[PDB]
Swiss-Prot record, chain A:
SMART domains: Ribosomal_S4, S4
Species this chain originates from: Acinetobacter baumannii (strain AB0057)
InterPro entries per UniProt: Ribosomal_uS4 (IPR022801), Ribosomal_uS4_bac-type (IPR005709), Ribosomal_uS4_CS (IPR018079), Ribosomal_uS4_N (IPR001912), S4_RNA-bd (IPR002942), S4_RNA-bd_sf (IPR036986)
Name of the featured protein: Small ribosomal subunit protein uS4
Gene assigned in the entry: rpsD
Pfam assignment, any one: S4
Top-rank taxon, per record: Bacteria
Swiss-Prot record, chain C:
GO terms under biological process: translation
Comp. bias intervals (Basic residues): 6-20
Alphabetized Gene3D superfamilies for the sequence: Ribosomal protein S20
The species this protein was found in: Acinetobacter baumannii (strain AB0057)
Protein known as: Small ribosomal subunit protein bS20
Entry keyword annotation includes Ribosomal protein: yes
Tree of life domain: Bacteria
Listed NCBIfam families: S20
Family membership: Belongs to the bacterial ribosomal protein bS20 family.
GO CC aspect terms: cytosol; small ribosomal subunit
GO molecular function, one term: small ribosomal subunit rRNA binding
Keywords: Ribonucleoprotein, Ribosomal protein, RNA-binding, rRNA-binding
Disordered as annotated region, ranges: 1-20
UniProtKB/Swiss-Prot annotation, chain D:
Designated name of the protein: Small ribosomal subunit protein uS17
Species: Acinetobacter baumannii (strain AB0057)
Record's keyword annotation contains Membrane: no
Keyword hit for Cell cycle: no
Gene: rpsQ
Range of residues in the leader sequence: none
UniProt KW keywords: Ribonucleoprotein, Ribosomal protein, RNA-binding, rRNA-binding
Function according to Swiss-Prot or TrEMBL: One of the primary rRNA binding proteins, it binds specifically to the 5'-end of 16S ribosomal RNA.
Length: 207, 82, 86, 79
RNA sequence: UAACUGAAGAGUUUGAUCAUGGCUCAGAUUGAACGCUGGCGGCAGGCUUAACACAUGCAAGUCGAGCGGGGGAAGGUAGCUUGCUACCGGACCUAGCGGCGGACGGGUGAGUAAUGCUUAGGAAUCUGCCUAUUAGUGGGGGACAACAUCUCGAAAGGGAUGCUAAUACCGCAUACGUCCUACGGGAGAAAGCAGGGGAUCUUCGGACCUUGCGCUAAUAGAUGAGCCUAAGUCGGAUUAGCUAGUUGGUGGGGUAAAGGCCUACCAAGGCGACGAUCUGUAGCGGGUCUGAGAGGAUGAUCCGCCACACUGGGACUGAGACACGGCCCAGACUCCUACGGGAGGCAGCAGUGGGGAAUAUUGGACAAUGGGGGGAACCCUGAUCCAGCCAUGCCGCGUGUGUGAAGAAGGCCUUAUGGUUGUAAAGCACUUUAAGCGAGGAGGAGGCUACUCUAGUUAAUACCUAGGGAUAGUGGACGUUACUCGCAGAAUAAGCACCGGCUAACUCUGUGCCAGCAGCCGCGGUAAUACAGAGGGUGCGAGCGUUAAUCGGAUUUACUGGGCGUAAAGCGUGCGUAGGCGGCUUAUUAAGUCGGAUGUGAAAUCCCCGAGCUUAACUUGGGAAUUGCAUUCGAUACUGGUGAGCUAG
């Protein structure tokens, strides 16, 4: 399954911008209702919360930003726990190594939903083959490119234009002329935003 | 008698065979005396296609084991490859 | 039986049983004669009976009616019992 | 290269046979305390050299009767 | 490099409190079932209950190069109503005798607490087909199916007389090995068929040479099976004595082989509180689930062993059976009949009735891996490979994307005009995964035949065997395969539970201790955040809930790891049997204890590093592990044994 419907209410409930919108207009002007929950009993962020509520709301934010459902997320956490290192670090690397996320951060998609649509419709080739699974893990050194049929597409041009305004990641080497990029390494925690607190998710799944 | 033959493993429509030495009266995938190699008809990339232990093969042949047709062909192939 | 080959096997079975029973009876009769001579106790008579009995035992053992180990046991024990008669 | 056991004769009434008691000390599987376990073996005595109370040695062999499969090797100590 | 690293609590007894102690809840798991809902793919799973009764089809045949007959097609020759007849040699087919196979493969867990299973050892055995080596295959005879005749029976099938072939059967001869032996000696086998051929002969069609496949006697190997020992393997004492072939010995019999396995005598033994006997339950293991571990539960799918084949008792044939689809006997049940006479056993595959909460098609092919027969061609194979049905489980994908607000309408709450549904919708601009249509298209097939050459064995270039070369034919159930490329359009696709506390998520109407809810604590008797509907929201998502069951939480049987003054719990008090434990010094032993080495601990499964599947599930290479068992070599502090000594008990 895959979430389809209103997007901004998710951000309003979470309390922050989860960038499901393209970004041409700021979140505040786009919603006019941020700082309030989307229910008929909508309140401000100053309401008290329990530890269970904090843990649940932390994991939900990561799930909504990355578009991942509960079963796959639990499988990811089990894999990260099995692998050596910091569990939250491994989980974030696994989430960032997804193909659709790589397409979004490489700029051919305005949003992760658009990138996922492209990947599903086989407009993106990994190495030299036309894949269609958005959950594929991209490994160091892989080459991502846009299919020649998918080139000269207006949505792709707009996406790269918006990506140019957005900050280019350090770990991705992308040329927009032929629309091709190279992955080199998993982003590190300092590379990732510091808003996300992986310790809450680890505590939740450890329970 | 004692025979050398293939035992079918793997998954549906992608077979993988173990080359075993066994009494002929046993079931195809059951009791056996010794495993001496493998055959993967659909290998690609870095996957090995055929591995056979020539020394044990010759030992059992000398003791009187009877290779099957396909195993004899595979032994000829491995000897040519080596 | 259900099949033709099973019926044929049954027919062959009964015929072979009759033939084998005849030969086995032969062996038993000769052994019994030798035992009777031994119980009689004359040395020469027992020796003659044993000399008659040995070839029949050997022939049936070679045909497979009895095992060759059985034949050897019979020969050895009968020879011992005859020799004891001095 | 033959299996031998050492024990104490507890009977010699039957003809050409002795009953020898073997003793071993093993640990309890769960509680770990060493406990004493004993078994009775029928052995073969051709010349009735063994008596009650002696310490003897037996060795495994082919069956001699329904319950005898051991033969006396030597008498270590006489009662 | 690595092969692990692992332990959470809450509610409830009282006007408060602390303790004790039950009960209930939060987790993981499933061969599950039921309710609501439902798009696709991959890989697995699918009568747990009646070892209940079974309609119908299939699941074991093959060899004419072992044998005699018997068939019906083509031909060729001669006659002539002229394309019809009469004969003759080749090509095919098989009811019967005979060989091999049918003891494998497949199903099930009734019985079985030990004749079974697991681990470690042993000696007194047999072993078709296979491998190596040695000695041979000489010469005769009497039968019996088919066939012919008779007869019973509607038949199915029976019975009686007369013939015949063989690699069917039995004498005689011979014997490198082999058996017995008194050490002198004695005893015992076999069968032919096919391919090719120079020379010679042909008593007239073969002899003779040679090569294959056979057959006989023997020794090793391998494989398979039988036999023995030790340790381990669930409850009950409201089951304490059990056993006369019983325990041992001798002579004899019997077996492939040890043995009371059997028998005639002699003796009085044998087992038991370390649980005999009796009784209840149960296939065992590798493993699976849970647990921090120790433990607990379990033995579907995969592998090993055992047992059974409608219920009991037997044996025959055979290398091997006391034989699922063989025979005899007894029993119960069912079927045909023309009343003469007969037939049967799905716990094989598919299927039917019945039972049940509940579990599928009366499908395709031997193309692949195997099994049986054959020299080969080839035939058989419900094993197997595939296909059909089912959200039963696990994994993956989709049900569209961006923009879009003086915030449309409608719904709901209200402090009565705002808030919320909400960028949500409409509108604008795009995209074609999956499904549908069209076109191409791997791999699962190594081989075989035809041709040519080489090397062997031969008298030979012939035959046969083993290799090399290139070319051409030939061979796929799945299957319209996987996969790739085009075609039209957002076009075909979202539900389920919950919102008082445990526990994430609140308001309004309706009803009034009624209707109802409920895992526990508890709600409802007019303003119900707990009943019913609605709005809103939360959690999951092709699923979501409920019931059932196991472990956990439970230190709530406590070995790790609990208690007994008053909470449950010290026998009314002594003495004493088996048992448990036991002062100090010294020498010796090496049973306990500890260390090394060797053998073993099947594969699969779990864990680690890799590989191949577009990813993942899944498949797979190599390791690590299997904490155990046995043998042997060492150590001597402690415990035990033996010898000596001492006085604090």
């Amino acid at each position: 399954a895959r979430y389809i419907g209103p997007k901004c209410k998710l951000s309003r409930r979470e309390g922050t911008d989860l960038q499901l919108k393209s970004g041409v207009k700021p979140f505040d002007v786009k919603t006019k209702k941020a700082n309030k929950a989307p229910g008929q009993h909508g309140q401000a962020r100053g309401g008290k919360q329990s530890e269970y509520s904090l843990q649940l709301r932390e994991k939900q934010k990561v799930r909504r930003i990355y578009g991942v459902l509960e079963r796959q997320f639990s499988n990811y956490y089990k894999e990260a726990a099995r692998v050596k290192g910091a569990t939250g670090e491994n989980l974030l690397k696994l989430l960032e190594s997804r193909l659709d996320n790589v397409v979004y951060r490489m700029g051919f998609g305005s949003t992760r939903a658009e990138a996922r649509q492209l990947v599903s419709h086989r407009s993106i080739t990994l190495n030299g083959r036309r894949v269609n699974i958005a959950s594929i893990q991209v490994k160091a050194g892989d080459v991502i490119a846009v299919h020649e049929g998918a080139k000269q597409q207006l949505r792709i041009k707009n996406a790269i234009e918006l990506a140019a305004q957005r900050g280019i990641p350090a770990w991705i080497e992308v040329d927009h002329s032929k629309l091709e990029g190279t992955f080199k390494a998993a982003p590190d925690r300092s590379d990732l935003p510091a808003e996300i607190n992986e310790s809450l998710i680890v505590e939740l799944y450890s329970k | 008698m004692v025979v050398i033959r293939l035992a079918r493993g793997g998954a549906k429509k992608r077979p993988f065979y173990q080359i075993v030495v066994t009494d002929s009266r046993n079931a195809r995938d059951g009791r056996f005396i010794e495993r001496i190699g493998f055959f993967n008809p659909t290998a690609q990339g870095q996957a090995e296609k055929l591995r056979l232990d020539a020394d044990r093969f010759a030992h059992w042949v000398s003791q009187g084991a009877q290779p099957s047709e396909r195993v004899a062909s595979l032994a000829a192939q491995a000897k040519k490859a080596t | 039986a259900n099949s033709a080959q099973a019926k044929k096997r049954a027919r062959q079975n009964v015929k072979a049983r009759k033939h084998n029973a005849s030969l086995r009876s032969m062996v038993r009769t000769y052994i019994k004669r030798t035992l009777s001579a031994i119980a009689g106790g004359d040395y020469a008579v027992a020796t003659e009976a044993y000399k008659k009995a040995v070839p029949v035992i050997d022939r049936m053992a070679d045909k497979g009616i009895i095992h060759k180990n059985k034949a050897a046991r019979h020969k050895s024990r009968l020879n011992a019992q005859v020799k004891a008669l001095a | 290269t033959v299996r031998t056991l050492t024990g104490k004769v507890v009977s010699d009434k039957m003809d050409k046979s002795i009953v020898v008691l073997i003793e071993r000390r093993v640990q309890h599987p769960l509680y770990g305390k060493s406990i004493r376990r004993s078994t009775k073996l029928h052995a073969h005595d051709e010349n009735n050299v063994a008596k009650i109370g002696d310490v003897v040695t037996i060795k495994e062999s082919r069956p001699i009767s329904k319950t005898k499969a051991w033969t006396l090797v030597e008498v270590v100590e006489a009662a």
